[PDB]
Design a protein around this ligand. Sequence first.
Ligand SMILES: Cc1cc2nc3c(=O)[nH]c(=O)nc-3n(C[C@H](O)[C@H](O)[C@H](O)COP(=O)(O)O)c2cc1C
Ligand code: SF4
Ligand code: SF4
Ligand code: SF4
Ligand code: SF4
Ligand code: FES
Ligand code: FES
Lengths: 230, 59, 41, 212, 66, 430
Amino acid sequence: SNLIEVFVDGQSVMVEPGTTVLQACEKVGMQIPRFCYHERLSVAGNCRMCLVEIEKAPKVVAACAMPVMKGWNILTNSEKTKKAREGVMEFLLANHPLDCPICDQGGECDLQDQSMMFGSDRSRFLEGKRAVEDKNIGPLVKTIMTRCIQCTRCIRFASEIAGVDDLGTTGRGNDMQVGTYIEKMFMSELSGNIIDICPVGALTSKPYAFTARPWETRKTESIDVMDAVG
Amino acid sequence: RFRGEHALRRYPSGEERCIACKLCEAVCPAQAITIEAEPRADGSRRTTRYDIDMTKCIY
Amino acid sequence: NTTYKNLQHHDYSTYTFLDLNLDLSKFRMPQPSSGRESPRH
Amino acid sequence: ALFVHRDTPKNNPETPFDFTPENYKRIEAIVKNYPEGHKAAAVLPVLDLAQRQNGWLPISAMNKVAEILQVPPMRVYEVATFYTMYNRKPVGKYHIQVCTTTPCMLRNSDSILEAIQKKLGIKVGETTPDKLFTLIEVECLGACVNAPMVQINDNYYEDLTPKDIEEIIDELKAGKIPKPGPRSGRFSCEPAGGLTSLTEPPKGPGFGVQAG
Amino acid sequence: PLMGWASTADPLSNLVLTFSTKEDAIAFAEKNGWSYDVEERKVPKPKSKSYGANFSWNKRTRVSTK
Amino acid sequence: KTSFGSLKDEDRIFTNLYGRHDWRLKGAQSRGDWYKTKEILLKGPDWILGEVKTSGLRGRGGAGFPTGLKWSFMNKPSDGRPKYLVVNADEGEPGTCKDREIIRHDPHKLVEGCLVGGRAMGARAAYIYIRGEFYNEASNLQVAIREAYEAGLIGKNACGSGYDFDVFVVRGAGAYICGEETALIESIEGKQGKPRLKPPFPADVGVFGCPTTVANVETVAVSPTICRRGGAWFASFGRERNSGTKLFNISGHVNNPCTVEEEMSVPLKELIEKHAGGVTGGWDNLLAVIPGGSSTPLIPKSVCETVLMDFDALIQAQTGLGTAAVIVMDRSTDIVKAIARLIEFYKHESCGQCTPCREGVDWMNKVMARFVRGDARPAEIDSLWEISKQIEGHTICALGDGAAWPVQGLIRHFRPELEERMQRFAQQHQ
Ligand SMILES: Cc1cc2nc3c(=O)[nH]c(=O)nc-3n(C[C@H](O)[C@H](O)[C@H](O)COP(=O)(O)O)c2cc1C
Ligand code: SF4
Ligand code: SF4
Ligand code: SF4
Ligand code: SF4
Ligand code: FES
Ligand code: FES
């Protein structure tokens, strides 16, 4: 009845065909750490944090965009899984500036939480650290593109949901700006949703900008007005 | 390294040194720090209110 | 042999590729369509 | 290297740009190469046609390519900023590219750079105080079996030395473009001495065929 | 009115009681006396995503930007 | 078993590599092309796949997968969508000069190979992706395709068969990863040129979504002579697994640098000396020899006194053989400077999908610049070994692995020269 056996960490589970490895690991409750996978957008393999080891295999595969063959056995806490995660984390924190005090996602970043719970302790990379000139996406969205990790999730969101097609990658190598080439104010509907999509503090809110910090403000359930959907 | 009568420093020939990053409010074990932040017209992130109770302060 | 049989490419100007591409327009397979004329119809 | 447009009024649309109808006939042929329903694949050759119809491409040209091929403009901006033919800054009539990576550098490339440099005066990246001699160094052009090599517009030059650099630059100043073959013997990639490779004439049709 | 703080007449407001099932939550709320509104737990929907359908031929799932 | 041999004429796969013969359809027919090709088209793709798998054509282009198995992967039962053949004619890997020579001098043999490959899998069209920097040779290839269509040779009723087939030429725009296996496919589609992930292989999703296959110009150009000449005669050259003829391109610090055709199995010293002059200053003057090009670690002199030019032999020497770029470097040359410029090449030509190759090529270029100046301590060269371990095997494409290999080969073999450089800078700065 369309069932495939996957042994997540030895424990067996039946999984429908076609789904990714990460949906199976979330079917058993695990979380493989991730930056450019998102459960509402198309799957791209840019961030490379999502790597996981399959038993009896030389290479380390990407759990975001790997279909399920018959009878897997997946090690989420093996040796080279942890070595690959600490490696990718040590690459990501190189060209990322020292802005964690002045940043706006300082309580709710993902580089910080994953560099705690998966990454290394001592750093390296004595010299370098590129800096990119920031843009002006809109008067509603403050934009510091120095903090960008080029995960390409704002672009997939704009193109597949907002339908605007204004955000683009430009350049090669380290020089990959993510933005509008023509100084154009990205002004459309659902433009506010892009600040929750960007996982690092690059595309942040303009009126909220420097007024709070998320470990103090308490959360409360509520229902919208002014829209019939609520 | 004596501890008592804390005050805010400022830059050499410059502005206030604080950022309102709320690290001190997060770590204050007496919960004596009260920070309210606003940016000024220049665009640098700053404060409005930085109130300490010396009565609550265990130092 | 000792005589170089190129210099046919000695006098290729700028637009010669696209001019030959225009010259090869006919006798060509009819380019099978696929539903819509574009991903945005 | 200025990956933001920054209007610069020689740019800053609308700058007057238009195609000859013969180029419209070209674009008809190029779009008819590709299967119908995927008309967005002709952006690269049509944008190359715009590059050769107007020696450097403005933003009005990218907008016009987007209007003809009915794509969004931002994909055209991505394709134009990604590749290396599409020099977005304006360049001159001639365009010197000195190719140096490893074997070009390993066969004394810097003498060619200094020979260009003191024959022309201006340094890399920028240009002369008129048109037609924008100088850049580049990565591999694919003729590694020869000298550090010289590309002028759609033309190679292989197996050089600084005196041939001076000859080529003075004849380009005269306007008479030289022959685009390599210099100093071995007119193609040959062992320059006794030619110890194939010498006998080829056998022609049916030399040991089996189950044709 | 002397500093600009948030005074409150609320002892019970700063509580949170983390539980593990809805049944023990309802049992504790009915036992200890006060009223209760039990909301719902809303799981993420199990979808099916596919890179191969992100690169399709005739369908409209053509991302055109990666 | 011929003991690893050396090539002799009349058995070369393609003559007229130097342009000395008449180039036209008339000249190709005099040389022996388009001979009995209708009986090759009218015999069946089972025969061509059996012939290619029998001959043992090891695939060229740097990957090294066997070509017969890939063309057998293209035997999906036919659906409502067509099938494509993409002939990859780029030259990156500085040292290459490989199929520039073929695509300038004998394009009719490329049209041979693409027609036989299109018949070999039921393909419908052949897109030939040429490098953008090869404009004169692209016009020559257009002239060859024009004369092929004008003689009624391919097109509708290809060689008198009932099998239509067409060839299109896409000029590139200048890149290096457009030479890859799948960023090629996105460069055809009119996107920006970036690779795709591997779990969709091109035999399932390819050029706009149709199952296509990508083939190097050497494999395509050898592919008609495998069919029109003897069955497994191609495997009479060298060893058994990796066999046949290969171009060898000897550039750099050799006397009269050139390109030759030889056997696959051939000793390296005989390759260097007996076909392209000699090493400048005798054989003893050479410092190192890199085969393959820029995606292969180096070989010191004591190893290359013996090791022949085969895939498995160079893997036993722990260097993955790329494509034919067997170049040398002299004792009087800063190999640290040459390899640091090669890392600057990888920084100039690499996209930025993956965080590992992007950030790692950044660190390796800054660290190799500091080692050219000698501005560190040996813990830094050990950390360079650590990062070159961590980049390799965690990317989309093989450019990250290719950026990790020569740094590894340098740290494996020329350790004390780096120690001497850093000692010199310490003694001068102190
Ligand atoms: C960085 C890189 C460079 C490549 N360069 C070439 C090249 O110059 N020519 C080529 O045909 N394929 C090139 N390829 C693609 C692969 O070699 C591909 O497998 C090849 O086109 C066909 O392989 P095969 O001959 O083993 O079937 C390159 C791939 C990568 C990752
Ligand atoms: S985005 Fe995250 S890592 Fe970057 S400055 Fe902000 S909190 Fe720090
Ligand atoms: S701006 Fe944010 S969402 Fe967009 S690529 Fe950068 S990190 Fe990702
Ligand atoms: S908020 Fe507190 S910890 Fe942060 S900069 Fe100001 S004084 Fe320092
Ligand atoms: S490893 Fe680098 S060059 Fe290769 S796909 Fe990833 S980002 Fe691009
Ligand atoms: S989630 Fe798999 S690569 Fe980012
Ligand atoms: S490096 Fe100059 S031609 Fe290849």
